[PDB]
Structure 1
């Protein structure tokens, strides 16, 4: 059976935004008040959040911001699964909040972490929400040479002894734009400063191939005109390739009816670089936000060429018209919801492909009437073994992410604060609960998952804390593959 193997405390000082929600004009406008609680613009929990946990050999790497409101330092912790010991590096960068207003917490601004399986370099990307050289921080720091924030290490740093796991392992900024002796933030990944390439980026998320290649993807642009870009770590050269567009910017002048923005994630799944996403058109129509459900995969191990849709048909690369990668229309789940903004798709999208080729996508599609959600529909679209008709069903529980290991797909979450695991054979919608932490165990408020070598690494926020410093834990659960 699935069993909990290890439960480890990461910190009692994880940053939490213990204030109230602010609107974007408030967050942009209001001055600091000394003694205020830590208000926020989007979510209230920046840790664990984002691409913040990775496993490499016997090490679990976890990122987080340290509390409280006056600290906010970027932190990197390494847990050694062989010794049970942890070591943590404190970086000089502090969370800059909403457009430099560091007293308003900004959950888009996550700390992503990856290890190159080839040269054991550690890569960090943090605190970014589409910034650019003329971003107006309202007097809170100069961002002209700090709009893209990248930190990286010496080769072999991933596996040094705990005593040597320090900032000494990381490479300072020594370019003409360097800020000084404690500047660890680089403005580019290629060694070439390039505002056009590295401005307006959000959502750093790394993925790794079977042969040990490391990739990154981000979203570039705005909610009205946005693309996914991705690059590859060049281990032989100690740098990254040029960003490559999965989809164009300015599609309205290149063959689409209008500009659009992309809402999804690239992953490495069943041996291929792939992407799943929904589209925001910003048309005056029945869609309050996103529309459609899309998927494509590359038969190129570098993911640069040979892109295809679910049917195996080649797609235009870079993509201009999203409909080429169509899988289904979530609008069809609410077919009488035709009034302006009556179909509200604002999240809950995910997708996976199992090691047997089974394709799975989930979505949440809400009916929006007089400024309120009046109906929530969860969908599960799947195709067994990559062939045959797509099945879309709404007989799917309220889950927001899908995971895979061996032949199965999994739903993983918190129920009454306790981790559970539901599992289904790939290519089916037949789920059964196979793990639930017992009564008397701890309660958690939030969690992020990382699946590695048949085990579930659950990076969790403990429930019930107070103030702007909370406790996080790492759980290691054997999926019994």
Structure 2
């Protein structure tokens, strides 16, 4: 029953890093040519939490194309009329550590629209930025601008197409305003005293609760010392709460044997705030070069403020200090190496929970040393049916980067030879089948997905040369 219901071009020129990959030794001599060099990956548009359906619209964010442009953009697509109206913001992608010549793929444009009062929310262009000066890592380039929040008056999301302009959005008019085209707010609470609470964050991601409340979470910190922080939109007062931690930072000072970072996602699923991740311990003497384990917890509090529990319903220390409390299993156990740093876990992790409360995790493990003779590589699917005691754990699985769910089913959705495909399985099972594979039309380089209404919103960038490429929105019915 899977089928493409619409494909809609949004622009001919969104930003893309088409230049050379830089590193620690080279990033300070980026090309001044027409090619746009980058430091991590090439993707920045149609990337991250950049697509949201709201009533009969779909809102999308992107970076204006052209190495020399880079403006934050917001588009609203009218599903009934076919009209795509775009707003161009003044802020331009500031690049790796604030140098626009080096593309920075972390700095996505997160987006949300409040069902309660029709305000629009955007957090963007952020990668652990703090206040510092000429001698710091960031050379003073983010002072009074390390958290970048833009948002509209009430009702902006429903205004006629002629009124959907930058005039719908609220200026920074505080003591720290950088001027007349300052649309970036340093906090979401409206109180600059809260500013340290918004420092050093990455990865803006929004959810809507079952009662229409906007939730938001970001990641503080780095590789082996990080935390998830989450907050809530007060639509009545048109402001957000301060950020609250899922786990403590600097766990080793809060009672843990080691500091650890997190690689995973918080998600609002089945009407609860939940988290699934692999940890990255600061210990460099054990067998895991980077990540290890699979962890999961959920909150019985509507806003996540306490009452956390692990998969077995046991109370979790909160904010969490010791990840052991919520560990499900060790992907490391599926490879035989035990020597220090011999086990490599980074890509291929995600998780989901079905409407029937089937819990699913996917992961990937390989030998650190790819040249060894007994090299090993497995993909893992760990899943527990609703009415099951234990998890079923299998390496009879091809691997994936994401897992999705809708209704009774789980899905794997991505690109194969430039075209979207969908694989589907019953919730609580490992029985995946390809049920959809686009086979004609322009091909795509990358994209990002949002599931809702039994549909996948696949926000995509078309393949091509240069650093200004077209964007298309595909709406795919999953047919559940």
Aligned to 1:345: 345
C-alpha distance in 2, partners of 1:78/1:426?
33
C-alpha distance in 1, partners of 2:31/2:427?
53
Contact persistence 1:101–1:140 (CA under 8 A): no
Are residue 206 (structure 1) and residue 203 (structure 2) matched? Answer: no
Q: Which runs of 5+ in 1 are unaligned?
A: none
Contact persistence 1:353–1:360 (CA under 8 A): yes
Aligned to 1:163: 162
**1:324-473 → structure 2 map (5 Å cutoff):** 324-334=325-335, 336-369=336-369, 374-385=375-386, 387-438=388-439, 440-463=440-463, 465-473=464-472
C-alpha distance in 1, partners of 2:375/2:91?
43
Aligned to 2:181: 182
Deviates more, 1:123-132 or 1:267-276: 267-276
**1:270-309 → structure 2 map (5 Å cutoff):** 270-284=270-284, 285-309=286-310
TM-score by length of 2: 0.96
* Structure 1 residue 433 displacement after superposition: 1.2
TM-score by length of 1: 0.96
* Structure 1 residue 66 displacement after superposition: 1.1
Contact persistence 1:272–1:298 (CA under 8 A): yes
Deviates more, 1:6-15 or 1:284-293: 284-293
Aligned to 2:58: 60
C-alpha distance in 1, partners of 2:146/2:24?
19
Aligned pair in 2 of structure 1 residues 135, 292: CA closer, same or farther (>3 Å)?
farther
Q: Aligned-pair RMSD on alpha carbons?
A: 1.7
Aligned partner of residue 157 in structure 2, secondary structure: helix
Contact persistence 2:95–2:102 (CA under 8 A): yes
**1:30-179 → structure 2 map (5 Å cutoff):** 30=29, 33-134=31-132, 142-179=141-178
Deviations for 1:251-283, whole angstroms, at most 9, x for unmatched residues? 112121011111111111112110111111121
Contact persistence 1:200–1:220 (CA under 8 A): yes
Aligned partner of residue 9 in structure 2, secondary structure: strand
* Structure 1 residue 359 displacement after superposition: 0.5
C-alpha distance in 2, partners of 1:358/1:207?
20
* Structure 1 residue 380 displacement after superposition: 1.0
C-alpha distance in 2, partners of 1:374/1:421?
31
C-alpha distance in 2, partners of 1:263/1:459?
23
Contact persistence 1:132–1:195 (CA under 8 A): no
Contact persistence 1:133–1:195 (CA under 8 A): no
Aligned pair in 2 of structure 1 residues 35, 425: CA closer, same or farther (>3 Å)?
same
* Structure 1 residue 24 displacement after superposition: 3.5
Aligned to 1:476: 475
Q: Which runs of 5+ in 2 are unaligned?
A: none
C-alpha distance in 1, partners of 2:376/2:70?
38
C-alpha distance in 1, partners of 2:58/2:218?
23
Aligned pair in 2 of structure 1 residues 210, 279: CA closer, same or farther (>3 Å)?
same
C-alpha distance in 2, partners of 1:279/1:368?
17
* Structure 1 residue 356 displacement after superposition: 0.4
C-alpha distance in 2, partners of 1:277/1:142?
32
Deviations for 1:418-437, whole angstroms, at most 9, x for unmatched residues? 11111111011111111111
Aligned partner of residue 223 in structure 2, secondary structure: coil
Contact persistence 1:150–1:185 (CA under 8 A): yes
C-alpha distance in 1, partners of 2:260/2:141?
31
* Structure 1 residue 304 displacement after superposition: 1.3
Number of aligned positions between the proteins: 476
* Structure 1 residue 26 displacement after superposition: 2.5
Contact persistence 1:130–1:202 (CA under 8 A): yes
* Structure 1 residue 188 displacement after superposition: 0.4
C-alpha distance in 1, partners of 2:195/2:173?
18
Deviations for 1:40-59, whole angstroms, at most 9, x for unmatched residues? 11011111111111111111
Deviations for 1:232-252, whole angstroms, at most 9, x for unmatched residues? 001111111111100001111
Are residue 318 (structure 1) and residue 316 (structure 2) matched? Answer: no
